[PDB]
Amino acid sequence: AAQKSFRIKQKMAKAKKQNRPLPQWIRLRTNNTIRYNAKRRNWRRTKMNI
Amino acid sequence: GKGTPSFGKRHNKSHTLCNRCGRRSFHVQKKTCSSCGYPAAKTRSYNWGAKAKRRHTTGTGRMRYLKHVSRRFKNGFQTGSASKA
C-alpha cells in the first residue's frame, strides 16, 4: 500500500527499529540469562496482522 | 473450488485498530470494536470469559496513578514537606 495512513507508518517505524539483534555487551553482564532476541520478526515468516 | 482457489481472493480488510484497545478489532462497516466495544461508554467484558477478563483486568498495565495510592494511605495523606532535621 503506497498510500498509507500516519498511524500505519508509525507502526512501520517502530517495527523497523525493533528488528535488531542483541546489543552484544548484554551477554557479559552479571547474572545474565538472555541468550538471543527471542522476539525477532521477519517479513517472510510472520506477518504483522495490523 | 471452494477452498484453495477461493482463498486467493481475500484482500479486503474488515477489522482495523481500535483507538482504545489497539487490538485491530474495529469492525468498520459497523464502526464497533469487538474487544472494547469502543464507541459504547463502558468496557465490553463478560463473566463467562474468565481468561478474557484476566487478559485486561487492572494490574496488567502501568497503573500510572494507582501505584502510589497505598503509599499515600499508609502515610496518611500528609501535606507540607520534610523538615531537614
Binding site: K9, A13, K14, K16 | -
Partner: protein, 71 residues
Amino acid sequence: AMKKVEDGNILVFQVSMKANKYQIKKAVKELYEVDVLKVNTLVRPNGTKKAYVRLTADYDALDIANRIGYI
C-alpha cells in the same frame, strides 16, 4: 546530506515531529541569523522528521556549516 551542503547551498536538520514549516523557518532565522529561501520536509522511515532548508544567495551553507561546528 554533506554533499547537499556544499553543492545545493542546503542545510539538513532533524526536527521534532510537532514542528511545521513556519516554525522551522522562524527557528532557523533566529538561531543562525541567516535568511532562508524555502523549507522542504519529510518523515524518514524511522519516524523522525527531516527538513531540508535552502538559503538565499546572500549566505553560504558551507560557511555557516563549520560555524555551527560540523564539517
